[PDB]
């Protein structure tokens with residue numbers, strides 16, 4: 390397809406009641422699910438990125454890292470909270486105990502898969518705006534994709550930071566849309 394939808398880290402631990410919740414993150418699930426249905430209908434590639442951490446990951450507080458344990462491989466916290474079609478491409482990131490990966494491109498084959506499927510433009514949604522959404526969007530820009538941010542299908546943790554990240558992405562050429 391020429392376009393792809395990239396759904397970033399829509400997992401149980403990043404939703405309210407999870408180990409690392411994005412405030413009101415569950416509120417965007419109907420709209421993310423709607424975009425998935427829409428892109429599926431447009432015959433677009435659908436990609437879902439997930440944090441897929443081993444126990445004792447370097448980013449966790451048990452290793453002096455910044456975050457509580459979250460999105461551990463083969464646990465309920467790592468499960469998707471969105472409805473994905475059978476032909477969704479699943480990208481698992483940060484799987485090695487001593488390597489972190491914020492962007493869905495970092496340490497993965499995402500660029501290669503996108504190009505292999507003839508993708509030219511990518512639509513980004515998911516959580517959190519100022520963290521893995523931002524990083525993924527900026528990395529897609531690096532690789533030469535036209536990048537869109539789905540305004541009504543992202544959520545971040547702090548309003549001031551979400552604010553800064555959106556302004557930043559726009560300035561670097563990422564287009565903010567909804568439909």
Ligand SMILES: [Zn+2]
Nearest residue numbers: 440442448460
């Ligand atoms: Zn993580």
